Symmetry: C3
Subunit: 182 residues, 3 copies
């Protein structure tokens, strides 16, 4: 009930398979003075090693068809087939604590301007009178109102978030827009 | 120092254990013309394979007591014993970029209404005068103010977020409330 | 079958390959125990083990994939997470759904008056109480000048000193007396 392999103290002992003259795979204690135990394909160069404080495989690791990658990323059906890094980015609001100017100029009553970021469901700050930032969080394309410094601004988000239009304002003309980074 | 297994080129070579007449487990290169090396239980049908570009197990994979599931979900004490998908959902604000109406009507000064979701710590838009949406983010049940289109609205979130009351308004009567999806 | 290394045992009895160096049990592979079909690759010296069981495979210690690590508490470390553990990457990268708030200042700051607040208020959700006992919401950006038509009239305020300073620049009948912040 035991196939007994015996070597001298601290000497290698492993099972080696060769097909033809080719080293194919091995399992066991591959080196003298080293107690790591390895299961290795020479042909694939793919390895599992039992080491002192952990086990390791040297390439990506599949669990069924889910994948644990060598960079620590995970892919599987639970993440909608995405890698986890992308699932997270798409799924949850980023704590960037940074903003970006998407537009600068002057947009009086009736004037529509155009930006290269989708402004829908974003945190924005609009600068109108008195060199202050007026906060707003947009929903989808639509009509919004803010009692911005100077008086007030009624504005429209249109064109799938790329259009920003001053519908009407009372002494509160937008001259800059920042957006919180995603 | 080596147990040497030798085969013809590209022929299977493996070690097979049988208990009585039952195939029980094997290790090695299980098939001709295929360099994949496998450690397999025939009884359990549970397998580790070393392949060209990855190593793979065919069922859920435990690391101590933590679990990496075949769908890519992970369970562990670091996630409070939850699966990671649920930890994430519970822990972080959802980037849903979508909204839902929670009430529609007319709530003049003093009028209280029931809303369809708990509005505490939520992103909301209230429509009052002039067909525009006024943004607000609520905290707990309490008293809030917004200089909404038309003038202003002092409002109350009550009844564990299920009640919305117009305390007072100046020419700014609410008629619709949207909430950002969670 | 003459070119397979065949290990044959009685039904439901252990059979494994054991390697010993000198007198020391060093490693084994196979069916370690009677009446039990679990198959194990184990180092006796390291005490590190892989086991194939009925419904799962298991390693008994942290498991590395290249240099990435899946720990026994379910945490993951890797270059994708900036070399951080995923728990910290998540905490640092994404907005907490805390649904709770904390008071960061209480007092009375009229026009021109500046106060110290107890948290960095940059890129935070805050609520300022001015006139009429109501909360006025604002989300801040970095240090800078901001405006809110808060209950009473309006308030132009400044976040300064790396988020630790709050100054009433000017107000119209809307003097701040308390500020709450959403918990991170």
């Amino acid at each position: 009930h035991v196939l007994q392999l015996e070597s001298a103290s601290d000497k290698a002992h492993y099972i080696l398979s060769k097909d033809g003259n080719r080293n194919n795979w091995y399992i066991g204690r591959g080196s003298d003075n080293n107690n790591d135990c390895t299961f290795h394909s020479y042909v694939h160069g793919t390895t599992l090693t039992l080491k002192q404080d952990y086990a390791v495989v040297n390439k990506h690791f599949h669990v069924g068809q889910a994948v644990v990658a060598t960079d620590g990323n995970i892919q599987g059906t639970k993440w909608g087939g995405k890698w986890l890094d992308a699932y997270l980015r798409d799924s949850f609001v980023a704590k960037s604590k940074a903003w970006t100017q998407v537009w600068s100029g002057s947009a009086g009553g009736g004037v529509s301007v155009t930006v290269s970021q989708d402004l829908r469901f974003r945190n924005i700050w609009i600068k109108c009178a008195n060199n202050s930032w007026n906060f707003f969080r947009t929903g989808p394309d639509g009509i919004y109102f803010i009692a911005s410094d100077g008086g007030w601004l009624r504005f429209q988000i249109h064109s799938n978030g790329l259009g920003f239009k001053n519908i009407a304002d009372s002494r509160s003309v937008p001259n800059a827009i920042m957006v919180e980074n995603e």
